[PDB]
Structure formats: structure tokens, C-alpha cells
């Protein structure tokens, strides 16, 4: 158990659990769940409407002071009714801590823009719009950031094909670069690697 196994830190676990309880008590209107991971990471699952309040508290409360936005991104889970999972990662330099805030949305429900709370969110939100198609309300300048001009679709969605739908090439007749339906000389070879035996008993699900 000693040499090859990652050591635990119970002090950080207890501190993060106490602070999660603190945050949940302060904002019952929006906090739905609090978790502390086995490697001491604190996550708070909230309601979408509380995106702006919660973050503001976490940035401005004297005991939180999470003044840095490390990252903001989305996760696509098609099996859920609310497809998209919005994740905020925040860093507090005063207390040398990190926090995660999660919420959810679907294709037609907008999320409140948090550029007023963190100016770093701007491009991040644009990226989430470009890769996933999640609209952010009251964004100062929302448009594509990563994809090509005129690109249709949202590539990071799970149902989006890996190679996309169109490819580009130079055409000498029209004397310009044109886009055409995609054709692959060698199709990408899909591998089925999942072993038919269970790996982790601790994560077994009920048999429904």
C-alpha cells in the first residue's frame, strides 16, 4: 500500500467538506449538491438561475475570495435531458484553494453570461458557444472563436462526426478554395476496446 499507492490527505478533505457545508448553508436558493472527491477536490452543483449570484459570492465573500477563474467549459452527455454541463473552475489565492461549480443547460435554454463577474469568462463563453452551441445571455460580443468562417454545426457535440461533413481543396476552374462533401481515402477504423469484464466494483450500478 505504501510505495505505488497515492497517499491521502484527510485534513484537506475535512476543510473542503466544512467549506462546502458553509457555502450550501449560505445559498440554499441555488445549491443542489456538494461533493468532495477522493483526491480532495470540492464541487458544488447549482441551479442555472444562480450562476451569477453564486459566483459573485464566491468571488466577493471575505471567507471565499475566489478571485481567479482558472477555466470554464462544457461537457456533452446526450443521455441526459439537459444535454450540456457547464463547469467553472475557480482559484482563491488568499486561501490557496480551488473550487468547482457545475450547472446544466439544454440546446434552447440560455445561460447567464458571467463576464460581469469574471472578465476571463468572455472568450471561454464564446468557445462554449462555438464548440457546443450553448447561448449566453447578455454577452458583450458573442460569435465564433475557434471554427472557420461560415462553419455549420458544433464540433464538440457527441453526435458530431469526427471528420465533420465538408472538406476543403483548391479548385483551378473557379480559381479559389472550395468546400465539398467529405470523402476519405482511408476511413477511420473504429476500435471496440471495452473489456466485457467489470474493472471497478466500487462503481457498480444497481441492476435496475
Amino acid at each position: 500500500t505504501r510505495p505505488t499507492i497515492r497517499p491521502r490527505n484527510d485534513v484537506v478533505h475535512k476543510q473542503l467538506s466544512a467549506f462546502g457545508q458553509y457555502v450550501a448553508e449560505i445559498l440554499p436558493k441555488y445549491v443542489q449538491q456538494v461533493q468532495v472527491s477522493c483526491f480532495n477536490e470540492l464541487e458544488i452543483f447549482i441551479h442555472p438561475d444562480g450562476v451569477i449570484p453564486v459566483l459573485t459570492f464566491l468571488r466577493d465573500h471575505t471567507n471565499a475570495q475566489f478571485k481567479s477563474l482558472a477555466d470554464l467549459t462544457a461537457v456533452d452527455v446526450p443521455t441526459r435531458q439537459n444535454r450540456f454541463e457547464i463547469v467553472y473552475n475557480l482559484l482563491s489565492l488568499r486561501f490557496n484553494s480551488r473550487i468547482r461549480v457545475k450547472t446544466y443547460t439544454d440546446e434552447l435554454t440560455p445561460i447567464e453570461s458571467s463576464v460581469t463577474v469574471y472578465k476571463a469568462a468572455n472568450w471561454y463563453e464564446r468557445e462554449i458557444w462555438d464548440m457546443f452551441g450553448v447561448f449566453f445571455a447578455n454577452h458583450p460580443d458573442l460569435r465564433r472563436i475557434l471554427t472557420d468562417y461560415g462553419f455549420e454545426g458544433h464540433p464538440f457535440r457527441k453526435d458530431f462526426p469526427l471528420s465533420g461533413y465538408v472538406e476543403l481543396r483548391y479548385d483551378d476552374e473557379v480559381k479559389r478554395v472550395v468546400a465539398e462533401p467529405v470523402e476519405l481515402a482511408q476511413e477511420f477504423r473504429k476500435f471496440d476496446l471495452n473489456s466485457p469484464w467489470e474493472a471497478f466494483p466500487a462503481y457498480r450500478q444497481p441492476p435496475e
Partner: protein, 176 residues
Amino acid sequence: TYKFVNMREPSMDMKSVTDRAAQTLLWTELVRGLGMTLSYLFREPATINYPFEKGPLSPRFRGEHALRRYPSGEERCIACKLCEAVCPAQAITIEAEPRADGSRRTTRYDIDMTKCIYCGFCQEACPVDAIVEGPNFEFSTETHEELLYNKEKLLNNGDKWEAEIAANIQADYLYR
């Protein structure tokens, strides 16, 4: 533990003021930079005489791929397809069948060298040291098609470079 890089205060004595005025009016630090460049002018340059001299390399160097043989002249590859499964760029294509003598050998072994990232994962995965990345790196072509290697080309590369490949493997197989 931290240090300040720009938190120093200039001395205000008459001698220091006159020294700074001389620096401003006579350009002392500019002459210092000129002296640095002049010093470099009289050093020996670091250039080598390519192609007559070459840059140093290592027995671990990853270059052009090759398929190897046993000392009997039989191929080492048994068509397990581990290299194809591990290839991060899907650059390897393999087809196999029983040989006329019942041996388990490939009938197709292609490496797309314009797909390959030259990571060496294939030779780590190979259990018989059949596919290797050789030491050659001067194999530029004039056409795209010349970089689509089939089994004949790789077998040819192995036969051509085996003398150096075996010596490179002998000097590094104890680190693997």
C-alpha cells in the same frame, strides 16, 4: 521566498550624478553592447559543414521505419497487430493469412509516413522486435505517393539498414 527585480534606488551624490550624466552624454552602455558583439566576432562559430559533418544523434533516435528478420532470414513479424492497435495516428494497416507452410505472416503491411508522428510506440508494442524506427532521417521525396510504404519497401529498408539497426538495439536493449 521571493526577490525584487526592479526595486533599487539610484544614488544622489554628486559623483553618481556626474557618472550618470557621462553615461547619458557619452553613451557608455551602448559601447558596452558594441564590445559584446565585437567579442563574439572573434570567437569560433558553432556552424558545422553539412553534409560533410553531421549533428550528433543517439541509439534511441527515431527515424525511418524498418521490418526486421531473424538471423535465418525469416521475418520477425507474426502479424499480431499490436503496433496497429497502439498507433496513435492510425498509420499502420495490416492484413494477414496463414502462409503456404502454415506460418502466421502478413500479406499487407503499410505505414503511411504522412500520417505517422514518429513516436516509436509501435516498436515498444512489438513483442518480437519486428518493427523498428531506424536511424535514417534523410528520406525526403519529390512526390506524396513515395511516402506510402508497403511491406516490400519496409522489408527493403530492413535489409538495407540492419547492420546499423542491430548495433543500435544492442546498445539500448538493456534500458528497455
